[PDB]
Design a binder for this molecule. Structure first.
Ligand code: ADN
Ligand code: ADN
Ligand code: ADN
Ligand code: ADN
Ligand code: ADN
Ligand code: ADN
Lengths: 256, 256, 256, 256, 256, 256
């Protein structure tokens, strides 16, 4: 199957257009919507979203990702062939997902070849419908990427900077994601299970417990989350609205 | 076919993870989204949504519902087997849907027996991806619930208070649901159709008509609705904003 | 394949019911969601959405559209048979889509004939679930529209006025759509590529470029768009935000 | 759903080619094999097979039948549009099936229009793969027959003579089919339940019972059958074996 | 999915009729043909065939088996609910398959209930199309057997005698199956790997090797087979035509 | 989509086992039967059948072919990757199909790596169910062959002699296939179309016409055929029985 991640929004024809276009090229493709509400142009959030889906997807799955603020410009459209596939703009969007994929090859999609398979013209502002979507549909049915692209160096693709630095014993982490519940996710993984977590920027000591219900309603806590990162949440409340933080912001955190 | 109802939200990887996880267990399950926008942790609301879908669903349909504020706590995860199936947390979510299901037996999902099918660790904060989703996928492909759970008494599961109260011929109804148009659904059903409905708390008299268009724009009415419950609405307006009521509120009502 | 376009909203059971009702009629129908977030009762907006999807859908595709403020009134429920199908309320919703369909026949759905196929009572406020959904599903599995309807004149159906007028060298263009990015779409097509677009009501002179990134972040511009309509946008910003416009407004535009 | 009935045989690539050709036109078509073992060029036998399948197929079903001894000659290739479809060579193959289809229109497939859809050259000896298969597939995904054909008179098509004649009290019945068990099927239907059936050509008086087991193993009998035609059988034996008959022979039968 | 095993034959409409009937009741059922060439009325061979398929089928699979010489008589039509399902005539056909199924319940299908789900009349000679097939299709979509049958004692079903006896050191086995290659299968399993195998009825000593190619072309051998029984084969020849044996025949075999 | 071609035969559990085994690995693989009636162990015949199917198959199609007399021996099991995929035993079966596949690489299936995917023991006499079928199902769902095999040189695989020989202007052609009608296919292709074809060995002169019907019933002709090879046939008769030739025989032929 093919998963879809974009920032197109839900109030319009964009998502539908991409889907029917994909079905034109592969009518029996099983298309799974991850989300289309990724913050406009937010490559980092889009990357986090895909990273999570990729972690639980069956090997052989095709992932189309489209947070393309640079659509129409000279940025490359690539295909990452490996354990699973990634069809995304060469803008760093593949960074997080790549952490969980055994890469075999990378290909730059060639617009002229892709239009050979689609039949319709390639717009300058909607590549998800004219390039990325079709490309995903082609791979799903067995077409090799070589057929519509040229290989490129694996290490020649834009990579985002998502790893945290540490000043002594203090962690300087960043908010890589915020869900609809207001739960805040921080770019810290593989750490040792703390007993407490202090958000030095707020002079708050937090209990580090397994789940929301372990603290009373309205109270804040830290948990190992469900995506292997450090999570900060308010039981039945919004941790984001408390600490009043955003994706991209940095926080000094000390793990006790 | 499997239906999905959650409070997960639309911008995140949550829904996508549960779907690929389900497909990873039953690669050709037909998954139908109901909604993922149920007000956060609102079991009553989630229960109303499931009730409606269950009423029109083909017999044999499997319904996965995840509004689970108590995720990872002592609360049980259950499977209800009958006319159709319900796979939800044991927190009352099944209350309304149960009204339309010929129940044969109920089972408690035993985590370890489930992990034997999935192959991956059960998180403490995302049972929709690690327990409920997989359980639904298994039932869908023919696996009996006994395979991953132990039978329990129907009467043992948690239930919500959903009965309307009547003081003489004044009804004390509860707002069980408000849709995107602001139409207010009150928990009154199977009543003699009135000519007028008066909302005693607002000193309003409303005509009881069959549809929105039967009154001028901006005018308020009461109708049979499409879900067998008494509906209050404003033709092309929002009864919820005009009456300023929220799910859970109680209204003194008299039918003339 | 069947497409869906409604103004039902995503926070509710409405979309779920229509779908399970459809799958009940034709259990193996492939249903593709276009959108259910169309502004309440906005027939024009719905019409634009459908037009775009129809242009890229394969021939044979069935399109169910439901933006029905007059549900339950005397307004007709029709089926437009052509190289693609449209199942919609006779309220002008089919106006734009018709521009890309060569119509063969038009039918008026007879409620009593449809009930013979569904088996359940038809409500007064939810025809999408009891009439339109079923109709689309029946056509999808091969049933001829005549079985549940009678032929009517192609030009007897409601039409919206979507044509832009020009006085002198000034275009009076209407905002037929606004997307989640705030990009504004005007009802002007088949025009000669301008160098600059002037929005007289704002004293704004905008550059006509190929894509968003061709200007600085925050700068406004005009583009050929990706839907064959003049598009007013703000690089990574909201054009509708600034111009403070909304679907339906008419702008005086000068093409230089 | 599309059904297939041919005389291609099972020891070859013929059936495989027609199928992959069809899936090439409509990759998600559900193809159901009826039989490909019809006696070579036996149009009558093919017609009986199709009749039976048509009687139980759901409305909307497309039936491709290919028993084509005159492939490549001037014989027409037609499409019979009704509450069910028939895609067959105009050689009388549709005779029996028509008895259960209310015909709406009949078309003559235009080779050049079909080639526009397939993309490959049309052979002279394998139209099932290059014309009929494609035609069925196109209709299945929603393309109207008119796109690749022109309407022709319903009664302008070849018909077989399948009516049984009666002289006095003696029926002259034809063997329209013989199954793998050797059970013989005569073209007599809508007759009053006899007590005994006499096969004059054999001086055999047979008992008319409900099923095989109602007589001794090895004994011959007559039954109402399961296809609404008089059936001559031998309990766990071959009736055609003994009577030494074959599809096409005419038996003089007396109904007592 | 549903598997199908019958003795209907391939030259006719029987198999097709059952399939379309099943799709009427469950149009998205995945139907897999095991075989339809089981020797007429041969319950033992039919049982062996099913036993093998059941061994490799996914849990939850539904198996419809129809070798029904007693069709129309008073023999019971049952459903065996367990690890997997068996929908077959109560004539011993379930014997072998039951060896690999964790049985939960057994049900006698009630003709009157089944016709409630089908809509068409139940013939006396074709229960595969009017009872067994529909029943299989119902279970595949989630309907419980209780819905169209009444439970009966697990041990009240006809069982075939398939186990071998042993006179001292000599085995008196029977031929339970013969494939198209002429390979002979004998009802002996779980035995200790012999070095030689003597067919005392022919005064032949046979090498007991892993596969056909281990002996020269035309030579006979014994192997553990691929179905866990003792197999007798002629490399690239017919072992059945040599020993000139049939299904059901007994052979005195001594394992050295 | 996956096609299947074998010499398994039609009456047995062999084909059914391979299909459920495949579905057990890839539950939603679309499996298309070509034939299972290839003359026992005839690699040449099996190769011809696959060639034809491959010619009309959509790019990306996976073709599983099992005619494997050397099953369980030293013979390798291979996967050929390219335009489409071939999964067959390394015994020459791929010879003809290879002519129509743009080969990218070839792999040898490593038994132990395959068992890691299936979960069950590999038999010594049924690799179609334990190796070839599973391998095809894996490729179909996106698994790269590298995952269960090691690359090998294209030129290393076994190949059949299939070239036609010419002695001056007499051709020495081979009967590469005979279908169910008795039409004889000779291994001659891309030749200047003749007016007459004389079979020197029978002192027969045959007209070269486009189809069967162009000669009287019972008469013999030569035609282009539908598979690009020279075909000899008898209008409504059997050229194979008239010439009394079998696959593999050689005929001295001259084109005038
Ligand atoms: N106004 C805009 N400015 C910049 N990018 C835009 C704008 N509107 C749409 N895009 C989109 O940005 C998305 C990635 O953020 C791409 O899918 C691209 O289509
Ligand atoms: N901050 C939170 N407090 C309580 N429950 C939560 C919180 N975030 C998510 N959940 C619940 O946990 C599950 C997965 O998000 C859902 O039941 C969801 O409603
Ligand atoms: N309050 C409302 N007023 C008018 N239309 C509504 C309202 N709520 C929903 N509708 C939508 O418009 C149709 C007619 O009212 C309904 O079936 C639904 O599609
Ligand atoms: N030898 C033959 N003579 C006549 N018909 C044949 C012959 N072989 C195949 N056919 C079948 O009849 C059609 C016309 O000959 C062919 O397309 C095929 O369907
Ligand atoms: N002539 C016959 N005698 C006995 N049984 C028959 C005969 N013809 C068909 N049957 C079939 O026997 C099959 C089982 O052997 C059943 O499917 C039943 O339909
Ligand atoms: N008796 C036999 N001798 C040689 N090969 C056989 C024999 N029986 C089956 N096979 C082959 O083994 C595989 C499974 O039957 C196929 O390749 C088949 O042709």
């Amino acid at each position: 199957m093919i998963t879809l991640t974009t920032d197109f929004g839900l109030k319009g024809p964009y998502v539908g257009e991409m889907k029917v276009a994909m079905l034109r090229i592969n009518p029996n493709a099983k298309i799974v919507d991850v989300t289309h509400s990724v913050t406009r142009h937010s490559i980092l959030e889009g990357s986090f979203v895909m990273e999570q889906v990729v972690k639980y997807s069956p090997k052989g799955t095709v992932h189309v990702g489209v947070i393309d603020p640079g659509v129409g410009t000279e940025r490359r459209a690539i295909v990452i062939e490996g354990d699973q596939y990634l069809v995304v703009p060469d803008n760093g969007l593949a960074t997080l997902p790549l952490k969980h994929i055994k890469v075999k090859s990378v290909y730059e999609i060639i617009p002229d070849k892709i239009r050979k398979f689609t039949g319709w013209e390639i717009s300058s502002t909607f590549h998800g419908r004219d390039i990325f979507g079709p490309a995903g549909a082609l791979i799903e049915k067995g077409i090799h990427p070589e057929e519509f692209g040229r290989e490129i160096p694996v290490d020649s693709i834009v990579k985002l900077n998502v790893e945290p630095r540490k000043e002594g014993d203090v962690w300087i982490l960043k908010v890589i994601y915020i869900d609809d519940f207001g739960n805040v996710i921080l770019n810290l993984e593989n750490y040792e299970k703390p007993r407490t977590v202090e958000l030095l920027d707020f002079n708050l000591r937090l209990p580090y417990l397994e789940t929301y219900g372990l603290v009373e309603k309205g109270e804040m806590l830290a948990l190992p989350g469900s995506h292997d990162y450090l999570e900060i949440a308010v039981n039945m409340g919004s941790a984001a609205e408390r600490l009043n933080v955003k994706v991209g912001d940095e926080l000094r955190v000390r793990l006790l």
